[PDB]
Design an enzyme around this catalytic site. Structure first.
Site, mmCIF file in Angstrom:
data_model
loop_
_atom_site.group_PDB
_atom_site.id
_atom_site.type_symbol
_atom_site.label_atom_id
_atom_site.label_comp_id
_atom_site.label_asym_id
_atom_site.label_seq_id
_atom_site.Cartn_x
_atom_site.Cartn_y
_atom_site.Cartn_z
ATOM 1 N N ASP A 150 0.820 -1.218 0.000
ATOM 2 C CA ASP A 150 0.000 0.000 0.000
ATOM 3 C C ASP A 150 0.856 1.272 0.000
ATOM 4 O O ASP A 150 0.669 2.183 0.826
ATOM 5 C CB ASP A 150 -0.970 -0.039 1.182
ATOM 6 C CG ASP A 150 -2.143 0.907 1.088
ATOM 7 O OD1 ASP A 150 -2.344 1.527 0.004
ATOM 8 O OD2 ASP A 150 -2.856 1.039 2.073
ATOM 9 N N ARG A 154 -0.242 8.925 1.589
ATOM 10 C CA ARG A 154 -0.961 8.797 2.883
ATOM 11 C C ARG A 154 -0.203 7.829 3.840
ATOM 12 O O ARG A 154 -0.342 7.926 5.067
ATOM 13 C CB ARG A 154 -2.411 8.300 2.654
ATOM 14 C CG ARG A 154 -2.504 6.849 2.111
ATOM 15 C CD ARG A 154 -3.929 6.439 1.709
ATOM 16 N NE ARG A 154 -3.875 5.172 0.964
ATOM 17 C CZ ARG A 154 -3.774 5.068 -0.359
ATOM 18 N NH1 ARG A 154 -3.721 6.157 -1.117
ATOM 19 N NH2 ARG A 154 -3.718 3.875 -0.933
ATOM 20 N N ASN A 155 0.616 6.922 3.270
ATOM 21 C CA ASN A 155 1.364 5.900 4.015
ATOM 22 C C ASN A 155 2.831 6.271 4.187
ATOM 23 O O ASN A 155 3.701 5.413 4.351
ATOM 24 C CB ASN A 155 1.125 4.495 3.382
ATOM 25 C CG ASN A 155 -0.312 4.086 3.658
ATOM 26 O OD1 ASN A 155 -0.880 4.495 4.656
ATOM 27 N ND2 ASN A 155 -0.957 3.297 2.808
ATOM 28 N N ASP A 168 2.938 4.252 8.553
ATOM 29 C CA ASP A 168 1.582 4.634 8.850
ATOM 30 C C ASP A 168 1.167 3.850 10.104
ATOM 31 O O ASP A 168 1.866 2.921 10.502
ATOM 32 C CB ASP A 168 0.647 4.291 7.657
ATOM 33 C CG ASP A 168 0.514 2.802 7.381
ATOM 34 O OD1 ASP A 168 1.292 2.281 6.562
ATOM 35 O OD2 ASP A 168 -0.363 2.167 7.989
#
Ligand SMILES: Cc1onc(-c2ccccc2)c1NC(=O)NCc1ccccc1C(F)(F)F
Length: 296
Positions: A150, A154-155, A168
């Protein structure tokens, strides 16, 4: 849990050594708190504490995760300090990254929005610095033969002095739900970041991370815009499988877009390794202003 290959080693912290200050976020599997940690590094420091919600199935998943996070120690991977298994809730202790996740940081420093960064939008030089640090983290993960399922801004987390690291606290599916396609009942796929072999053949390898990195590179040069934002999830799947590539971001020079295109070769074996992608971006990040000025 985001890693895929191809208990004594785990550091422990006393619960009295952890002083919760306040919540930083929450997901379906837990909560994150800012806390003060005493006698961790030679007196007191801020940390991000992930509290695991509730159980014996989750407890062994916690143990395997902490062992994996203990293995994974590098300059561009979020620092994992250890656990607190002294009762409940089970806690994972990480370093505190002042600016939060990279997607939020990019959005807040984009044309649609001062101790660490200058006013207005981020310059070409800083965007290249951001991309190079994420690529360095992937070089290390690829080197350990690990696949990050992933990889996305955002991570990634941003700390003081614009230090960027992959990591994350497992709340992306909750916070950024539109970045996932639910195939369920309990499965959410980050399709917009996934290569054709992942979507079509359900295969995800080191080369699939090179593709996802190329999508990360695009997010950075668009200041955190969602890839294929104009399309629904099935339309996005159609583009990726048919071979339609993301268009050049306004802020992206042709030289950088050439790096993205190299990540997006339909055939996995044809894509450049993360090592080569990092080398090119780093060269651009540490390139003299005179050279950088004539690129962008
Ligand atoms: C989807 C998801 O669900 N639980 C998690 C989860 C588990 C335990 C600790 C934090 C996050 C998760 N995220 C996830 O595994 N991210 C990977 C990660 C997280 C922190 C530090 C480093 C890294 C790595 F190097 F990139 F591997």
């Amino acid at each position: 849990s985001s890693l895929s290959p191809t208990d004594a080693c785990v550091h422990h912290i006393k619960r009295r050594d952890i002083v919760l200050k306040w919540e930083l976020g929450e997901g379906a599997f837990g909560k994150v708190f800012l806390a003060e940690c005493h006698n961790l590094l030679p007196d007191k420091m801020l940390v991000a504490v992930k509290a695991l919600k509730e159980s014996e199935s989750a407890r062994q998943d916690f143990q395997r995760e902490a062992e994996l996070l203990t293995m994974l120690q590098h300059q561009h991977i979020v620092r994992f300090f250890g656990v607190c298994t002294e009762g409940r809730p089970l806690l994972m202790v990480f370093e505190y990254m002042r600016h939060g996740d990279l997607n939020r940081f990019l959005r807040s420093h984009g044309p649609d929005a001062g101790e660490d960064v200058a006013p207005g939008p981020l310059g070409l030089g800083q965007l290249l610095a951001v991309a190079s640090q994420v690529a360095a983290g992937m070089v290390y993960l690829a080197g350990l033969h690990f696949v990050h399922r992933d990889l996305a801004t955002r991570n990634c987390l941003v700390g003081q002095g614009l230090v960027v690291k992959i990591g994350d606290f497992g709340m992306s599916r909750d916070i950024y739900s539109t970045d996932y396609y639910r195939v369920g009942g309990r499965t959410m796929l980050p399709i917009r970041w996934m290569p054709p072999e992942s979507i079509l053949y359900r295969k995800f390898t080191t080369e699939s991370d090179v593709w996802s990195f190329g999508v990360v590179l695009w997010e950075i040069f668009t200041y955190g815009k969602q890839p294929w934002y104009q399309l629904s999830n099935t339309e996005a799947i159609d583009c990726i499988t048919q071979g339609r590539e993301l268009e050049r971001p306004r802020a992206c020079p042709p030289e950088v877009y050439a790096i993205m295109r190299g990540c997006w070769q339909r055939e996995p074996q044809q894509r450049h390794s993360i090592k080569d992608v990092h080398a090119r971006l780093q060269a651009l990040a540490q390139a003299p202003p005179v050279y950088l000025d004539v690129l962008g």
